[PDB]
Amino acid sequence: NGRDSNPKYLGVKKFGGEVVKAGNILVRQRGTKFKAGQGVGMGRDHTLFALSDGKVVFINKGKGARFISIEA
RNA sequence: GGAACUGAAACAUCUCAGUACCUGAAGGAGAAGAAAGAGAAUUCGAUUCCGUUAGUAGCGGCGAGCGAACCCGGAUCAGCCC
RNA sequence: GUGGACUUACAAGCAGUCAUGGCACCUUAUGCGUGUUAUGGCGUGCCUAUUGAAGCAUGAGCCGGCGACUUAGACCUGACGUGCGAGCUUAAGUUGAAAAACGGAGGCGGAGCGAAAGCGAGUCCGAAUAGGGCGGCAUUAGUACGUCGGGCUAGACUCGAAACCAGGUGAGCUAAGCAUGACCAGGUUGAAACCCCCGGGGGCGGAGGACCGAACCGGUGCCUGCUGAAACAGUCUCGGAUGAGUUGUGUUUAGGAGUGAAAAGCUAACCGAACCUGGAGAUAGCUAGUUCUCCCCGAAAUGUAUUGAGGUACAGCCUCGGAUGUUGACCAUGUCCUGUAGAGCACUCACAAGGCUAAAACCUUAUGAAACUCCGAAGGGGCACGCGUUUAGUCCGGGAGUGAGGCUGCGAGAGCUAACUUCCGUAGCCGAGAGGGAAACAACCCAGACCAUCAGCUAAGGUCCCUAAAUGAUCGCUCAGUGGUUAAGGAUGUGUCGUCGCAUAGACAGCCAGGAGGUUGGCUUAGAAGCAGCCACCCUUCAAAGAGUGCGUAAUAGCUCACUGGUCGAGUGACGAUGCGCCGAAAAUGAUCGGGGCUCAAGUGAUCUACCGAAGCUAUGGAUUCAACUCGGAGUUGUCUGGUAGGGGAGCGUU
RNA sequence: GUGUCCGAGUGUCAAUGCACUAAGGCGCGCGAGAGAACCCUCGUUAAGGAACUUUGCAAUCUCACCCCGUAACUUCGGAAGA
RNA sequence: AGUGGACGUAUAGGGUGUGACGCCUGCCCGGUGCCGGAAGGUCAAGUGGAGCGGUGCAAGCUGCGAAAUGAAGCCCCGGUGAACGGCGGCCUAAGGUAGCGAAAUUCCUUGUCGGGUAAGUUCCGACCUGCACGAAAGGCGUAACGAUCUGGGCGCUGUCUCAACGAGGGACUCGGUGAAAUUGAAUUGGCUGUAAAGAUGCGGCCUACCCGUAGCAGGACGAAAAGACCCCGUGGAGCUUUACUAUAGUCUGGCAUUGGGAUUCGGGUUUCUAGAAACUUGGAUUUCUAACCUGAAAAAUCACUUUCGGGGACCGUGCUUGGCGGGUAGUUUGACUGGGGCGGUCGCCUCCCAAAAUGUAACGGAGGCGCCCAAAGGUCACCUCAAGACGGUUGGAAAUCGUCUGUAGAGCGCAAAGGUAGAAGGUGGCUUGACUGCGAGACUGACACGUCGAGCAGGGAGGAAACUCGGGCUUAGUGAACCGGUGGUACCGUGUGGAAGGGCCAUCGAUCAACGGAUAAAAGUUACCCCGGGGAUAACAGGCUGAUCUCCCCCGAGAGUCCAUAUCGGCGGGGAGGUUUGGCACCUCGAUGUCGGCUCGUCGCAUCCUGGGGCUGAAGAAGGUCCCAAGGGUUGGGCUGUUCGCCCAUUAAAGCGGCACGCGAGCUGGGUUCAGAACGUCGUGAGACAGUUCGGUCUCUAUCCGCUACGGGCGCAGGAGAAUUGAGGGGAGUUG
RNA sequence: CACCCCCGUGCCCAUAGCACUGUGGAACCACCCCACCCCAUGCCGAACUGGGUCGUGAAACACAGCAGCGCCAAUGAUACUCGGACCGCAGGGUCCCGGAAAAGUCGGUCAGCGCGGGGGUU
Ligand SMILES: CC[C@H]1OC(=O)/C=C/[C@H](C)[C@@H](O[C@@H]2O[C@H](C)C[C@H](N(C)C)[C@H]2O)[C@@H](C)C[C@@H](C)C(=O)/C=C/C=C/[C@@H]1CO[C@@H]1O[C@H](C)[C@@H](O)[C@@H](OC)[C@H]1OC
Ligand SMILES: [Mg+2]
Ligand SMILES: [Mg+2]
Ligand SMILES: [Mg+2]
Ligand SMILES: [Mg+2]
Ligand SMILES: [Mg+2]
Ligand SMILES: [Mg+2]
Ligand SMILES: [Mg+2]
Ligand SMILES: [Mg+2]
Ligand SMILES: [Mg+2]
Ligand SMILES: [Mg+2]
Ligand SMILES: [Mg+2]
Ligand SMILES: [Mg+2]
Ligand SMILES: [Mg+2]
Ligand SMILES: [Mg+2]
Ligand SMILES: [Mg+2]
Ligand SMILES: [Mg+2]
Ligand SMILES: [Mg+2]
Ligand SMILES: [Mg+2]
Ligand SMILES: [Mg+2]
Ligand SMILES: [Mg+2]
Ligand SMILES: [Mg+2]
Ligand SMILES: [Mg+2]
Ligand SMILES: [Mg+2]
Ligand SMILES: [Mg+2]
Ligand SMILES: [Mg+2]
Ligand SMILES: [Mg+2]
Ligand SMILES: [Mg+2]
Ligand SMILES: [Mg+2]
Ligand SMILES: [Mg+2]
Ligand SMILES: [Mg+2]
Ligand SMILES: [Mg+2]
Ligand SMILES: [Mg+2]
Ligand SMILES: [Mg+2]
Ligand SMILES: [Mg+2]
Ligand SMILES: [Mg+2]
Ligand SMILES: [Mg+2]
Ligand SMILES: [Mg+2]
Ligand SMILES: [Mg+2]
Ligand SMILES: [Mg+2]
Ligand SMILES: [Mg+2]
Ligand SMILES: [Mg+2]
Ligand SMILES: [Mg+2]
Ligand SMILES: [Mg+2]
Ligand SMILES: [Mg+2]
Ligand SMILES: [Mg+2]
Ligand SMILES: [Mg+2]
Ligand SMILES: [Mg+2]
Ligand SMILES: [Mg+2]
Ligand SMILES: [Mg+2]
Ligand SMILES: [Mg+2]
Ligand SMILES: [Mg+2]
Ligand SMILES: [Mg+2]
Ligand SMILES: [Mg+2]
Ligand SMILES: [Mg+2]
Ligand SMILES: [Mg+2]
Ligand SMILES: [Mg+2]
Ligand SMILES: [Mg+2]
Ligand SMILES: [Mg+2]
Ligand SMILES: [Mg+2]
Ligand SMILES: [Mg+2]
Ligand SMILES: [Mg+2]
Ligand SMILES: [Mg+2]
Ligand SMILES: [Mg+2]
Ligand SMILES: [Mg+2]
Ligand SMILES: [Mg+2]
Ligand SMILES: [Mg+2]
Ligand SMILES: [Mg+2]
Ligand SMILES: [Mg+2]
Ligand SMILES: [Mg+2]
Ligand SMILES: [Mg+2]
Ligand SMILES: [Mg+2]
Ligand SMILES: [Mg+2]
Ligand SMILES: [Mg+2]
Ligand SMILES: [Mg+2]
Ligand SMILES: [Mg+2]
Ligand SMILES: [Mg+2]
Ligand SMILES: [Mg+2]
Ligand SMILES: [Mg+2]
Ligand SMILES: [Mg+2]
Ligand SMILES: [Mg+2]
Ligand SMILES: [Mg+2]
Ligand SMILES: [Mg+2]
Ligand SMILES: [Mg+2]
Ligand SMILES: [Mg+2]
Ligand SMILES: [Mg+2]
Ligand SMILES: [Mg+2]
Ligand SMILES: [Mg+2]
Ligand SMILES: [Mg+2]
Ligand SMILES: [Mg+2]
Ligand SMILES: [Mg+2]
Ligand SMILES: [Mg+2]
Ligand SMILES: [Mg+2]
Ligand SMILES: [Mg+2]
Ligand SMILES: [Mg+2]
Ligand SMILES: [Mg+2]
Ligand SMILES: [Mg+2]
Ligand SMILES: [Mg+2]
Ligand SMILES: [Mg+2]
Ligand SMILES: [Mg+2]
Ligand SMILES: [Mg+2]
Ligand SMILES: [Mg+2]
Ligand SMILES: [Mg+2]
Ligand SMILES: [Mg+2]
Ligand SMILES: [Mg+2]
Ligand SMILES: [Mg+2]
Ligand SMILES: [Mg+2]
Ligand SMILES: [Mg+2]
Ligand SMILES: [Mg+2]
Ligand SMILES: [Mg+2]
Ligand SMILES: [Mg+2]
Ligand SMILES: [Mg+2]
Ligand SMILES: [Mg+2]
Ligand SMILES: [Mg+2]
Ligand SMILES: [Mg+2]
Ligand SMILES: [Mg+2]
Ligand SMILES: [Mg+2]
Ligand SMILES: [Mg+2]
Ligand SMILES: [Mg+2]
Ligand SMILES: [Mg+2]
Ligand SMILES: [Mg+2]
Ligand SMILES: [Mg+2]
Ligand SMILES: [Mg+2]
Ligand SMILES: [Mg+2]
Ligand SMILES: [Mg+2]
Ligand SMILES: [Mg+2]
Ligand SMILES: [Mg+2]
Ligand SMILES: [Mg+2]
Ligand SMILES: [Mg+2]
Ligand SMILES: [Mg+2]
Ligand SMILES: [Mg+2]
Ligand SMILES: [Mg+2]
Ligand SMILES: [Mg+2]
Ligand SMILES: [Mg+2]
Ligand SMILES: [Mg+2]
Ligand SMILES: [Mg+2]
Ligand SMILES: [Mg+2]
Ligand SMILES: [Mg+2]
Ligand SMILES: [Mg+2]
Ligand SMILES: [Mg+2]
DSSP, X not given: OOOOOOOOOOSBSSOSSOXXXXXXXXXXXXXXXXXXXXTEEEOSSSXXXXXXXXXXXXXXXXXXXXXXXXXX
């Protein structure tokens, strides 16, 4: 063994209560650990970036049912 | 005739360098010199030396690095003979 | 070395430091004196290299004197200063020189974008519109010098290679050759050939890389010699000693070359490539060394990359200046994100007793999990505020160094739940840190040294003597020197509670009294009969006794026992929690808690004071760094001043 | 260390060997005491005899000439100074 | 040029290896070498120049440029071993002929038996199981020879038990001369602790009047040479080869020196009734003598002439071609690494570690990638998976159909984590958005790279539309830079116009996988080693730890007929000691000498003897085992360098360990570890192994402390002679 | 939001879901109804789908009861932990302050809010 692979510094890049420019990246994820609410659009590797400038808010009933909206 | 350390963080091309060194000829100097040229204005008008153009052009395992010439400004300026 | 003051012969000692006393002296000098001295306290040379230095790590005998960050250039870059300023200035040279002027060729600013053609405050990409660099805007003014910080290139802070190359010098040592001369006492052995008697005997003869042994040539073994008598020898012993011998002279062969009966041996006393001069101050990522003083700030041993790992590049951290202007920082509120501790089996692996059944499955019950999660804190990170105390931050430009870390505690891995082990996270100390405590001691506990005082309160730690300070006070605890070195395990050790029995209808040991019944009980080997031993315990006679405890020879008896009794006269026996202790408990020169000594506490657990105790804090005096505040550095108030690499600043000494 | 030449006598089979000595030459350019440990070159050693030690390393022992006598083996010479 | 070979000429000369003599010298031509062959494969310059292009109005000039034809040489085919070699592993070209064998070769190894000694790791003779013999890198013998090595025996010895006495030269004392290595400074003790972990110098405690002198050799990690061992340096040098690169040399084709001619000519021209005389441009054999080379004659080397003689247009030399070329030369030969080597690893992806942010090391625990898919894409539309039970045709535990349960227990191309049921899974229709030009904004990184990305243009594709498309559910499927190939484009293109060449856009070439990548192009070896450094880093020793080692204790199964504990103690548990093999890497690489012996010793006690005990399965005696006990004592020899162990023969007994595995400024020097050499084994080679074997320099001068002796001074309240008490210190201590 | 009830479509986002179950009927919805063709089944008008009444509330669906199941879930007490401060050689553990789960019990629920329309009491 003695093998390993680079860190992928994934996360909630922008936490609810953070104003965001358009195109800011807010969550990094392997998949849909977050499912993108209103105003946000999710990319190829399933990072989801805000489309509209404003505050970031978490809709989060959880269990795969967590969504990131942006409010203007 | 012609190095090698060395640099290239190794090392062959490269550089170190036509350096050091050996050998020949000669003088108070020597060399060179009177355009089958530079050059791009149909200009220049022998040779040598300084400043500059200029680290420009360019050369380079296009790497380390190596590097002009013309224009222009001065020092000195004689062209003579087969 | 000579002479004089003071001193020195039970003293333990980085050579001193402060203090006190004794003696001597009085020319910056009768003092807050100079020389010396006794005693007391205190006290790990210096530098370097270091995680860490008194080190038993390096360097150094001592004093002097030489001795290391330079110079260069029409170079690049920055800070400061000066002239001129939208412009600024020369170079080569020329003419003068006890003096400098002329000299515009040329350089820099003025426009940028593009790969370039080329356009031009626009420009490249492109088919038009999205960008990049750029001007407007802040038009940030440049340039010639001087000084200085850096950079470059050249020996480039100084010393130091082993090597490489060039042209020479060497065969007078030694390695061989050639020419030519010379030397080898003496004794032993007796080949051929030649000649007689029958290959053999005799004679005769004088051969040999033959024998012994002097010179001579050579070095076999011990010893001596080992700052030698000698830079390879000496005594003694040994090899050869007519041969492949020794030796003179003259002479030839040499540097990757010669010579070599072959060791890489010899080539002028260091030959796996001589010597000398030179290239040449070769290179040196390696070592050591780098000197005057004071002020201010102050690190790093981390990340990634590397023919990289002990070295470099770029970040990270330091400093100086400019700008900005609280953006910092801690703490609080609000919010969001997380899958650890824990905890759980709901999936995956595992796994514990059963029921159920052609056992997978299934149910009751029961568990572990870094790569399991139905769950899931504490904390932690981002944002916003400041609803609150503070002073840092950000970018831009010059200079750095650091890129070897060390411990402890917490959390993990690796290891053996070893290591003053190795590798990460994290906090603090050390590095770079002085002062008090811990006998001693970078890391631990206390506490960050501006200077001066024969002033005060305290921290940790202490208060019997060493040794500063209560032989303090009160309730105990341990009689072990435990204190002042572990454990599994044992113990009628001792206090504190605490759970279970049987007693003035009289029990525990304690003395006499009885020990019974089938039954010499079934089941066993050869006999096993309270009393080897696998299987099973009911029944009679009794105020009274279990087919019944350990012993006994191999089996029964035998003295005791569990209930019974006259006596006996009052508590006992059991497992338990614990507090302090005992054993368990052997290592190497001589013992010990730092020592004395401590229970007639100087141990201990609980409380409470009173004081000692630091370079921390307070007092008086004093000076720097900064900043405000005033007058044309000064002074006030506040504040700050441990320090390695390093950066900055003010100054002293020499020619 | 250094090449060549001459290098007497007594005795001893011989000799340039060994011992004494002629000629000739010299006592080695600090001395004098003293008679410890220890060290170097030496002499003798009870009893034992290799026990020593890596090894009999070293030190003994053997010693010249003459007579007698000498093996396994042999390349017929030698081993043999058995 | 000239020389040596050689004033020699195959019975001679050169090289290579074996190494008198004797009997001998087997197998294997596959690779490598070499010698022959030379049907065919390939192969340079040169001869040829068909065609492809520029540039000019054109003549023409000019850049490329095939086919065929071109030597040696290599591929191919034989052979060669007294050529390099090979003759073994429960198919290779073959597999060991004789001879020998525990060897100079034997690891296991002190092999087994015999011999010799009281005792034999040695030695000798047999045996053979030859790790890992062997036939001219020669095998088996051999008389004689050896300062050769090994084993034995005689002889004699101070080698020794065990040393003594004597001599001389030192050594000591006096007078004369009078150095040296060294040296931080010294007012320089013992223990025990502590500190970088070995203290004179830090702590406590003990001891110690001042100073010498003769001695010793424990300490001062004493002295000496900035470790020759080990590691490091993008140090060096010597040596090696099928590392790389060149190259003296060497072979080969063509051109010149270099020529007439006959002879066969694939061909040239004007020549003539498909044709041949003048003639060749050449090639080819063959031949010739004026070039040239060489030799003989009074004129030695050289020149002349030569009645001359031989070779001969070759040989030699100049240029150029291609091959051979460790002989020479200049170099390359990676890093991490709980010391180097060996093994492993080097880039990207997934998980745990990673301590609920991101991040985080390890030669830590697990596994994947160097691709795929014309549809596994875009879009539009449509389906729902495991698994179980009941029932069923050839099948039955599981084909297939049928019902019931069925937030998933399936699937998602490969590894896993996330994710997913309104799909990313499955199945069709259409087509390519697997587009060109851009990139607001962020994530991430020191850079450089990397990730995601709304929306705009041109234009597509699917859908009725909203809308979705600039690749795949996601995360791996990858390499800057240089130098070049291919297609466009029309920017530079040196006087001008063109073109040659260059630039740009697209694309191709990389286990450069040591994966940020030194060159286009590179392996070993050093023990002949050299330099510079490192205690940054191994071998020793000390330290820390104590797995392993040594010891004790608890339990108690059983053994002990019986009876656990007289003894012994399974399977398990707890400690101690630091003597073993270690780990770790802390002081020491400007030096800490290392194994064994010898000489001196001293300490522990886990006690071999001796002394005092308890229990005993103790009658007695001899024992067993445990307790207390460290005063003393603990033998001599054979084997091996040994420690050890075995053995002889005795003992009261033949103790175990510490003290740098105590002791080399005390001694040896056998072992091991420098240069020579040989054997086996490994390597083609230089060379190599902690396998073996012979051999191989151990440095007169003691300052200090410390130790044994011997004085000087002073002290001890007068100055003196002599006798003394013993504080307190040593020696002795055994036993049959 | 007059009272109910139906069809649909949201918010919510198992305290709403399952099962047992009962009411429902031409009003709404639902099956049945037929198929050459629109349109379709990798076979079937089962599914889409196109043409409709009867019939029937069977099934599905809506709505009520329902605490067997699931779903939620205290308090209390712990586990753990931020800071402080300690002991044990060690594995380990204690104390002060404050934050504080998970599991279980107690107990809670078969929901809760809109919007448009259709038909009822005519
Ligand atoms: C004193 C006797 C000899 O001693 C020696 O040969 C002594 C040498 C000593 C022992 C050596 O040092 C040791 O080196 C070991 C590798 C390590 C060791 N310890 C510390 C770990 C260390 O001690 C040598 C190499 C050390 C130094 C001093 C050195 O190189 C000495 C050279 C000269 C020494 C001496 C020289 O002897 C020469 O011998 C010739 C035979 C004589 O003729 C003569 O030559 C002229 C003589 O001198 C050179
Ligand atoms: Mg591993
Ligand atoms: Mg270089
Ligand atoms: Mg070079
Ligand atoms: Mg010159
Ligand atoms: Mg000259
Ligand atoms: Mg001249
Ligand atoms: Mg006194
Ligand atoms: Mg003293
Ligand atoms: Mg100090
Ligand atoms: Mg160190
Ligand atoms: Mg020192
Ligand atoms: Mg020294
Ligand atoms: Mg110039
Ligand atoms: Mg300025
Ligand atoms: Mg701008
Ligand atoms: Mg300037
Ligand atoms: Mg500076
Ligand atoms: Mg700079
Ligand atoms: Mg130098
Ligand atoms: Mg002879
Ligand atoms: Mg003889
Ligand atoms: Mg010799
Ligand atoms: Mg002899
Ligand atoms: Mg030289
Ligand atoms: Mg050579
Ligand atoms: Mg020499
Ligand atoms: Mg140079
Ligand atoms: Mg480094
Ligand atoms: Mg930097
Ligand atoms: Mg900020
Ligand atoms: Mg703030
Ligand atoms: Mg857990
Ligand atoms: Mg965290
Ligand atoms: Mg605000
Ligand atoms: Mg800067
Ligand atoms: Mg580091
Ligand atoms: Mg660290
Ligand atoms: Mg472990
Ligand atoms: Mg450590
Ligand atoms: Mg370490
Ligand atoms: Mg440091
Ligand atoms: Mg600090
Ligand atoms: Mg301190
Ligand atoms: Mg202490
Ligand atoms: Mg102290
Ligand atoms: Mg220290
Ligand atoms: Mg300190
Ligand atoms: Mg420490
Ligand atoms: Mg404290
Ligand atoms: Mg006080
Ligand atoms: Mg206090
Ligand atoms: Mg006191
Ligand atoms: Mg206990
Ligand atoms: Mg008291
Ligand atoms: Mg007080
Ligand atoms: Mg104080
Ligand atoms: Mg102060
Ligand atoms: Mg003042
Ligand atoms: Mg400071
Ligand atoms: Mg301070
Ligand atoms: Mg300071
Ligand atoms: Mg004579
Ligand atoms: Mg005579
Ligand atoms: Mg005589
Ligand atoms: Mg004589
Ligand atoms: Mg004389
Ligand atoms: Mg004399
Ligand atoms: Mg002697
Ligand atoms: Mg004797
Ligand atoms: Mg005898
Ligand atoms: Mg012996
Ligand atoms: Mg012997
Ligand atoms: Mg020997
Ligand atoms: Mg001898
Ligand atoms: Mg015979
Ligand atoms: Mg005979
Ligand atoms: Mg004889
Ligand atoms: Mg040979
Ligand atoms: Mg043997
Ligand atoms: Mg042998
Ligand atoms: Mg042999
Ligand atoms: Mg034997
Ligand atoms: Mg034998
Ligand atoms: Mg052979
Ligand atoms: Mg031989
Ligand atoms: Mg002989
Ligand atoms: Mg010989
Ligand atoms: Mg012998
Ligand atoms: Mg004597
Ligand atoms: Mg004497
Ligand atoms: Mg004297
Ligand atoms: Mg004199
Ligand atoms: Mg200690
Ligand atoms: Mg220590
Ligand atoms: Mg002391
Ligand atoms: Mg001191
Ligand atoms: Mg001595
Ligand atoms: Mg060194
Ligand atoms: Mg060295
Ligand atoms: Mg090299
Ligand atoms: Mg050639
Ligand atoms: Mg060629
Ligand atoms: Mg070579
Ligand atoms: Mg390495
Ligand atoms: Mg994390
Ligand atoms: Mg780290
Ligand atoms: Mg799909
Ligand atoms: Mg888009
Ligand atoms: Mg579009
Ligand atoms: Mg359409
Ligand atoms: Mg092209
Ligand atoms: Mg490359
Ligand atoms: Mg790399
Ligand atoms: Mg040598
Ligand atoms: Mg050092
Ligand atoms: Mg170390
Ligand atoms: Mg060691
Ligand atoms: Mg060892
Ligand atoms: Mg030293
Ligand atoms: Mg030394
Ligand atoms: Mg004892
Ligand atoms: Mg006894
Ligand atoms: Mg007895
Ligand atoms: Mg003893
Ligand atoms: Mg001992
Ligand atoms: Mg040891
Ligand atoms: Mg030793
Ligand atoms: Mg030896
Ligand atoms: Mg071989
Ligand atoms: Mg031997
Ligand atoms: Mg001596
Ligand atoms: Mg002497
Ligand atoms: Mg008195
Ligand atoms: Mg006494
Ligand atoms: Mg005394
Ligand atoms: Mg609660
Ligand atoms: Mg708190
Ligand atoms: Mg805490
Ligand atoms: Mg709490």
